[PDB]
CSV table of N, CA and C and ligand atoms in Angstrom, one decimal:
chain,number,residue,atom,x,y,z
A,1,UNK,N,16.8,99.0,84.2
A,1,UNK,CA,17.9,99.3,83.4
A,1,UNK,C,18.8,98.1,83.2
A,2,UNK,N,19.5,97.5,81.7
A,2,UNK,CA,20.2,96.8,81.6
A,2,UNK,C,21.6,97.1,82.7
A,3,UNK,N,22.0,96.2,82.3
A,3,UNK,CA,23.6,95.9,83.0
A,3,UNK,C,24.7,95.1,82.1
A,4,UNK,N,25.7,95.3,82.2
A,4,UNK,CA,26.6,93.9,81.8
A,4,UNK,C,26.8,93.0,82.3
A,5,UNK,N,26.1,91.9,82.2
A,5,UNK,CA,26.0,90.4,83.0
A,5,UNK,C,26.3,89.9,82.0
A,6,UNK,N,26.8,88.5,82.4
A,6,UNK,CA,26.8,87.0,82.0
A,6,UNK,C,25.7,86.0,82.4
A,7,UNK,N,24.7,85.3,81.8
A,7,UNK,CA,23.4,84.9,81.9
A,7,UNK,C,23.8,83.5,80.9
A,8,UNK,N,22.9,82.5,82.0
A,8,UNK,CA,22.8,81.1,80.8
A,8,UNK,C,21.3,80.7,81.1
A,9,UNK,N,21.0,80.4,79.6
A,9,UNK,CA,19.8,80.3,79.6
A,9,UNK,C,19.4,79.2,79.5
A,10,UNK,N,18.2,78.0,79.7
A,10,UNK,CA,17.8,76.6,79.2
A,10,UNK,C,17.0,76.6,78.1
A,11,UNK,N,17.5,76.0,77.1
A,11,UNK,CA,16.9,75.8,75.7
A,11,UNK,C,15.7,74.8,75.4
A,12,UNK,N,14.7,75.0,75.8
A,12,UNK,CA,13.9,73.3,75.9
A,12,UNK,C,13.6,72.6,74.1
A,13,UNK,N,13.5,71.7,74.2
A,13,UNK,CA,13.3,70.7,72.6
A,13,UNK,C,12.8,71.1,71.4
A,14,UNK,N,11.7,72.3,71.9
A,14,UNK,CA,10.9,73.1,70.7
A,14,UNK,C,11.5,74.3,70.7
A,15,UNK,N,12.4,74.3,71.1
A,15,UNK,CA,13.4,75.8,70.8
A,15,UNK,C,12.9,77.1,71.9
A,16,UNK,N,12.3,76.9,72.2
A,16,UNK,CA,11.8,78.1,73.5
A,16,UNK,C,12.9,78.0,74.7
A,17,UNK,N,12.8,79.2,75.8
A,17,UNK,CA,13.5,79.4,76.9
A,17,UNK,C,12.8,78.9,77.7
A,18,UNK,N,13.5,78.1,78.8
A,18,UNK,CA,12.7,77.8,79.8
A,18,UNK,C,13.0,77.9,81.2
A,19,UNK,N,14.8,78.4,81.3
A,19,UNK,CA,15.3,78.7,82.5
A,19,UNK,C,16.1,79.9,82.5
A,20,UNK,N,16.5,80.4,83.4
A,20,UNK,CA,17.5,81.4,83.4
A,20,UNK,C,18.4,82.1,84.8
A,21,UNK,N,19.4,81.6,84.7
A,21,UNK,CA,20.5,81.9,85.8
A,21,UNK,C,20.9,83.2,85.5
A,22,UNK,N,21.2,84.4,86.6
A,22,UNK,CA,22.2,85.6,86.4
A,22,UNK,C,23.4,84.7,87.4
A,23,UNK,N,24.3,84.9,86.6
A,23,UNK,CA,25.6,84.5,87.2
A,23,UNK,C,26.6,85.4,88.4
A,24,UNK,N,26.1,86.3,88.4
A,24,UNK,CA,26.6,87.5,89.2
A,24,UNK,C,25.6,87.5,90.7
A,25,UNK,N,24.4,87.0,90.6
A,25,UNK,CA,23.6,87.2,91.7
A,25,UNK,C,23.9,86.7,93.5
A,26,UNK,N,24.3,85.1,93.3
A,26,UNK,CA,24.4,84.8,94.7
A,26,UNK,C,25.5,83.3,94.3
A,27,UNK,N,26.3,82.7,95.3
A,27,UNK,CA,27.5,81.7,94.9
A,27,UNK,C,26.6,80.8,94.7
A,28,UNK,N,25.4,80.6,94.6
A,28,UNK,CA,24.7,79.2,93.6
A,28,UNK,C,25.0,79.5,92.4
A,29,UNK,N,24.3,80.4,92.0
A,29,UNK,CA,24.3,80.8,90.6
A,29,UNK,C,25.7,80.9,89.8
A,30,UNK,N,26.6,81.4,90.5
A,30,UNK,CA,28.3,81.6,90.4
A,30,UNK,C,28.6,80.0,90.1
A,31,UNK,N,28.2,79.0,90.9
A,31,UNK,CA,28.6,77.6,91.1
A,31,UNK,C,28.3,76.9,89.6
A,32,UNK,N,26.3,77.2,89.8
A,32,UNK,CA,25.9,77.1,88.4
A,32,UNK,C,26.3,77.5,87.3
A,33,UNK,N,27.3,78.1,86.7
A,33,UNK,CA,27.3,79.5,85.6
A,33,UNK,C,29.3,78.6,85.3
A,34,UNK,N,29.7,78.1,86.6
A,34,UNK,CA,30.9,77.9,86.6
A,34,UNK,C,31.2,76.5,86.0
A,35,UNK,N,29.8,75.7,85.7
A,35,UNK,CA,29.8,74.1,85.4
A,35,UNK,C,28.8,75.1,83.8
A,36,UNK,N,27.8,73.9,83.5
A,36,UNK,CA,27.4,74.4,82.2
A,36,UNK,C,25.3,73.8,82.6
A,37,UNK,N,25.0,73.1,84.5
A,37,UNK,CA,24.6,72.6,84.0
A,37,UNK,C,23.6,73.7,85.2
A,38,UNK,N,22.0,72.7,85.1
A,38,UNK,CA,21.1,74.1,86.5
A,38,UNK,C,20.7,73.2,87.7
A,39,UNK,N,21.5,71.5,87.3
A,39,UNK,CA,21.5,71.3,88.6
A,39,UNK,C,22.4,71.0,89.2
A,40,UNK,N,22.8,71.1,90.4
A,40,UNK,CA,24.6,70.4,90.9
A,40,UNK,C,23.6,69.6,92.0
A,41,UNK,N,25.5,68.4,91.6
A,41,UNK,CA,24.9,67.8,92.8
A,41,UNK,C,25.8,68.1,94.2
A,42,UNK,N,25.6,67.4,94.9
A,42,UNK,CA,26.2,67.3,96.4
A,42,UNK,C,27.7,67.2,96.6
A,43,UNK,N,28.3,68.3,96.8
A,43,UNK,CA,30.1,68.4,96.6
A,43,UNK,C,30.6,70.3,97.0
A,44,UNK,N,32.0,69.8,96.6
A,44,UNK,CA,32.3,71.4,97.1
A,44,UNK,C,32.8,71.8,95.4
A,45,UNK,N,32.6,72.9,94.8
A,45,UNK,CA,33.0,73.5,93.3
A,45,UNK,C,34.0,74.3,93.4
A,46,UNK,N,34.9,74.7,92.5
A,46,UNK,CA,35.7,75.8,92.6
A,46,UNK,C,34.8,76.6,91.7
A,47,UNK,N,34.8,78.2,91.6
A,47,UNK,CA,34.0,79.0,91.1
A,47,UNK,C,34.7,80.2,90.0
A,48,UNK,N,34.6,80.4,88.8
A,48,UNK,CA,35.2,81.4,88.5
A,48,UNK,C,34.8,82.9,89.0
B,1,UNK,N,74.7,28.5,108.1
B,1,UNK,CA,74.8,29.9,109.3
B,1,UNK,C,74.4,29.3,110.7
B,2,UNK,N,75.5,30.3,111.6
B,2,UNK,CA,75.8,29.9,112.7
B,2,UNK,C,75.4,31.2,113.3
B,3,UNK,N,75.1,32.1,112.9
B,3,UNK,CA,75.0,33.7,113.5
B,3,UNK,C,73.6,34.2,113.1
B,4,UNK,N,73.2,35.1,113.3
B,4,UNK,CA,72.2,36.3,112.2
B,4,UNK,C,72.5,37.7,112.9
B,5,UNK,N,72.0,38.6,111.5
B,5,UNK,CA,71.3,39.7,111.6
B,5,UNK,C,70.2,40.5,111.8
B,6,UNK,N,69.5,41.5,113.1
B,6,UNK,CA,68.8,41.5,112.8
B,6,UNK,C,69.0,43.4,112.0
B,7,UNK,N,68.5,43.2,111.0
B,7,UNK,CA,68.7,44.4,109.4
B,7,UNK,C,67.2,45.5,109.7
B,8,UNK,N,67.5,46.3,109.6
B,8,UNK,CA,66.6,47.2,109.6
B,8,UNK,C,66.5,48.3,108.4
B,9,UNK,N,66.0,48.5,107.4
B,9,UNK,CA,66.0,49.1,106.2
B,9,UNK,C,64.7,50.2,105.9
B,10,UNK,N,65.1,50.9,105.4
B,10,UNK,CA,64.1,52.1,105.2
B,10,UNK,C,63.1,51.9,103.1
B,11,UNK,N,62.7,51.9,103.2
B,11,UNK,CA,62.0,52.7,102.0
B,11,UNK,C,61.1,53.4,101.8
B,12,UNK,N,61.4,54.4,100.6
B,12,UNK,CA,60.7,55.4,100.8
B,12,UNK,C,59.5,55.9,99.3
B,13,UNK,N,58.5,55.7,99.4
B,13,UNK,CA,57.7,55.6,98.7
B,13,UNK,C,56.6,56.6,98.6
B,14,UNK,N,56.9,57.8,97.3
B,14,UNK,CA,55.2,58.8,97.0
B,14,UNK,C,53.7,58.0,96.8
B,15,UNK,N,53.1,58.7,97.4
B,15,UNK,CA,51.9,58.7,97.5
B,15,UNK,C,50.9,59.8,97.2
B,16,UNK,N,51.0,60.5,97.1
B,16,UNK,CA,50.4,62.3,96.8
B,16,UNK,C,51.6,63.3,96.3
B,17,UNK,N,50.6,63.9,95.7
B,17,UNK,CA,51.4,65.0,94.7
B,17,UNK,C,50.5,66.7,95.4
B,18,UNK,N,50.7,67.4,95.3
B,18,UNK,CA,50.0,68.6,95.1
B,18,UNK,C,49.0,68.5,94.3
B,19,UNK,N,47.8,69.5,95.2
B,19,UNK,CA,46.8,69.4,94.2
B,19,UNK,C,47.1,71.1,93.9
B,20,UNK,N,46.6,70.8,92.5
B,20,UNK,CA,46.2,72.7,91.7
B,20,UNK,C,45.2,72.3,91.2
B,21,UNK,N,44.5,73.7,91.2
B,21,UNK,CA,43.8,74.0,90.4
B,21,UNK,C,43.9,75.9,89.5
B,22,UNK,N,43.3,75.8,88.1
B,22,UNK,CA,43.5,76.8,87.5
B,22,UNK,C,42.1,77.3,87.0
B,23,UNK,N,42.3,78.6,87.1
B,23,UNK,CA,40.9,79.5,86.1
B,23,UNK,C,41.9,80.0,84.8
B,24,UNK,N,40.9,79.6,84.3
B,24,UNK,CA,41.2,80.1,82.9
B,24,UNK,C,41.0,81.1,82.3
B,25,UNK,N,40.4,82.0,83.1
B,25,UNK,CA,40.1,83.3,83.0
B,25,UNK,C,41.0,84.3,83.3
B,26,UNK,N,41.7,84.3,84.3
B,26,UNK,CA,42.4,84.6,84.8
B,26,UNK,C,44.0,84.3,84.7
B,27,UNK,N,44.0,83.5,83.9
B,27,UNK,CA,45.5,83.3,83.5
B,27,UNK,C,45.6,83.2,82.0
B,28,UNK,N,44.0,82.8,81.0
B,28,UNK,CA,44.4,83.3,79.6
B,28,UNK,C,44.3,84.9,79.2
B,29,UNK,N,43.2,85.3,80.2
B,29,UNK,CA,42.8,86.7,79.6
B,29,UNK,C,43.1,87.7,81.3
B,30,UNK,N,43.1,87.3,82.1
B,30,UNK,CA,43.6,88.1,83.3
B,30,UNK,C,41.7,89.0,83.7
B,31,UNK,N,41.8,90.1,83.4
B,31,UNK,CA,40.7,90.3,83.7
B,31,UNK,C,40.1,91.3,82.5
B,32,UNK,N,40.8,91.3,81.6
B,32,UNK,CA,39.9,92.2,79.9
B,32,UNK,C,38.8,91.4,79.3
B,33,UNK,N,37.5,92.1,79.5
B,33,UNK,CA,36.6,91.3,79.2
B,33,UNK,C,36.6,91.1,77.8
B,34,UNK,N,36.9,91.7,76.7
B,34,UNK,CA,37.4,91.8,75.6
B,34,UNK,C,38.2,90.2,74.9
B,35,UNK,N,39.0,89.8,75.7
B,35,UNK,CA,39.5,88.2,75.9
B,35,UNK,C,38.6,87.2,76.0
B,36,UNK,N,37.8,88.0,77.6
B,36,UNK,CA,37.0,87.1,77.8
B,36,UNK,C,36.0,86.9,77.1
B,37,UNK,N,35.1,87.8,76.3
B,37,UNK,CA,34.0,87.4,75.2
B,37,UNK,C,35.1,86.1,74.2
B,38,UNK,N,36.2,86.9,74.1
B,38,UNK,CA,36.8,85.9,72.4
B,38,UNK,C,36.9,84.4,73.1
B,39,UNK,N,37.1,84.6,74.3
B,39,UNK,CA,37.4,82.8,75.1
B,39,UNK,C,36.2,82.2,74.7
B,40,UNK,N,34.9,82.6,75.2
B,40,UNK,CA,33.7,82.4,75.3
B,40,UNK,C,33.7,81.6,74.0
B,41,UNK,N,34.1,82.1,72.9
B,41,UNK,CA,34.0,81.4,71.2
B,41,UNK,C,34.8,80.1,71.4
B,42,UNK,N,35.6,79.8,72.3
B,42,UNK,CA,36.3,78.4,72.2
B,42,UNK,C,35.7,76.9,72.7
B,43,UNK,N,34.4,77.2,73.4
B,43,UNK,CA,33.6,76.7,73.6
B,43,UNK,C,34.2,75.7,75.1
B,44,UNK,N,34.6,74.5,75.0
B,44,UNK,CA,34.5,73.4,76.5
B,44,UNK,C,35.8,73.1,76.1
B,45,UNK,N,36.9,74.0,76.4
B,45,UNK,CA,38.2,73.5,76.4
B,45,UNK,C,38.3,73.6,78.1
B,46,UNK,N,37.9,74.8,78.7
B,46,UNK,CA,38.3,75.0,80.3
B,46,UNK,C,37.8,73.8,81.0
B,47,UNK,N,36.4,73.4,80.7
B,47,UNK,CA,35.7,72.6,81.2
B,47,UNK,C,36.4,71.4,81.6
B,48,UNK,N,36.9,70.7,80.4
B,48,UNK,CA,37.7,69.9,80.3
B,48,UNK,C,39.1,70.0,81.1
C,1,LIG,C1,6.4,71.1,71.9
C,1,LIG,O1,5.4,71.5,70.9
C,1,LIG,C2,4.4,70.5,70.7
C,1,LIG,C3,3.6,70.9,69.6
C,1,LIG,O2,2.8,72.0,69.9
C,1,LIG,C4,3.7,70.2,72.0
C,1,LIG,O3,2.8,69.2,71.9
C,1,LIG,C5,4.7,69.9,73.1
C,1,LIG,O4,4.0,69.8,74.4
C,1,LIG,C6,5.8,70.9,73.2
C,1,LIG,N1,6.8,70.5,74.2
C,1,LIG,C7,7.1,71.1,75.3
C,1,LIG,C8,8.2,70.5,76.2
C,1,LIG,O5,6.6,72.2,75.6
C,2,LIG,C1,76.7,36.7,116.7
C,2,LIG,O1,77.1,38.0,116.5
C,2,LIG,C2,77.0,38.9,117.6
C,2,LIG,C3,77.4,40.3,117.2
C,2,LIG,O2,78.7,40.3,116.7
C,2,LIG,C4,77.9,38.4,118.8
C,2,LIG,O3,77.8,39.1,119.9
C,2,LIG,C5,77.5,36.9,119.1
C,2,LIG,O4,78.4,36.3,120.0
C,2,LIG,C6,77.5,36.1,117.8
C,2,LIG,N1,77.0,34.7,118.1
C,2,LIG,C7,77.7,33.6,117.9
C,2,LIG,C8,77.0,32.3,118.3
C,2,LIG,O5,78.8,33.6,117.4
């Protein structure tokens, strides 16, 4: 069953999907979801 | 001069300010997700 989430997805070169964060799952994803990018580096984030 | 003083003087000099930080979520749209889709259209202003 769907949900109302917030999801970002990776767009690769030939226009296909190739990653996909749920933002609501665990404070990585929250961290990830709160920058724009799927890797962080080494630091502390504020989170929305 | 035949005498001296020895002067002792203070100065007083900033160095740090308060840090803040703000969500933008919560202070443009509070918590109506209704806001928050229309924010989503403004694209990397928060970011910034
Ligand atoms: C994009 O498509 C081309 C043409 O089929 C293919 O050679 C290439 O490997 C694809 N690139 C990726 C990153 O999948
Ligand atoms: C210099 O001033 C101090 C403080 O008033 C005084 O005690 C001392 O005698 C003075 N020295 C001379 C050489 O006048």
């Amino acid at each position: 069953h769907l949900k109302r989430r917030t999801m970002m997805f990776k767009y690769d070169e030939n226009g296909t999907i190739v990653d996909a964060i749920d933002c609501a799952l665990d404070p990585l994803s929250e961290t990830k979801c709160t920058l724009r990018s799927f890797i962080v580096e080494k630091g502390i984030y504020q989170t929305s | 001069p035949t005498n001296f003083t020895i002067s002792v003087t203070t100065e007083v000099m900033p160095v740090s300010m308060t840090k803040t930080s703000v969500d933008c979520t919560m202070y443009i749209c509070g918590d109506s997700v209704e806001c928050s889709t229309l924010l989503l259209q403004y694209g990397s202003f928060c970011t910034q």
